[PDB]
């Protein structure tokens, strides 16, 4: 028997689950992408072939998704490092969390705007 139920606890819990998910995302991408970059010790034409197949609109929205993942992971990791090293850290947990929510929204709407204007002028 296995019951299925949602705990509905702190917001730091959802921060941690997003942290874990985005970290694993970047790890798998990094494996694949170090390979395709290692294709540069083979041929300029091989490298150009591959990275040109990386210039499609699907891969563009995926670039936006990966930008989001790395940005959230970086901000939340700063929060975690602060909690651990700063002695008054655990008191301002939720303050830091709201601050990095704000920073993420700002920087990410800016980054989507820039990447979007590039994708627009490229079509």
């Amino acid at each position: 028997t296995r019951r299925r139920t949602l705990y509905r606890g702190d917001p730091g819990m959802w921060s941690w689950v997003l942290h874990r998910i985005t970290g694993a995302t970047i790890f798998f991408f990094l494996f694949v992408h170090v390979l395709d970059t290692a294709l540069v010790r083979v041929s300029p034409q091989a490298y150009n072939e591959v990275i040109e197949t990386y210039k499609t609109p699907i891969v563009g929205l995926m670039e936006i998704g990966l930008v989001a993942a790395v940005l959230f992971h970086a901000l939340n990791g700063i929060r975690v490092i602060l909690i651990d090293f700063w002695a008054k850290g655990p008191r301002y947990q939720r303050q830091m969390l709201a601050v990095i929510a704000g920073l993420f929204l700002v920087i990410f709407i800016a980054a989507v705007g820039v990447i979007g204007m590039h994708m627009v002028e490229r079509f």
Partner: protein, 31 residues
């Protein structure tokens, strides 16, 4: 050749999506 790397890309996306749903599943199931 390019086909190998697009195959690698879709495999990476499947592994990524599987891990996301598996982490959430292990979070919500009572074991």
């Amino acid at each position: 050749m390019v086909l190998f790397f697009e195959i690698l890309l879709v495999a990476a996306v499947l592994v990524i999506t599987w891990f996301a749903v598996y982490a959430l599943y292990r979070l919500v199931t009572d074991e």
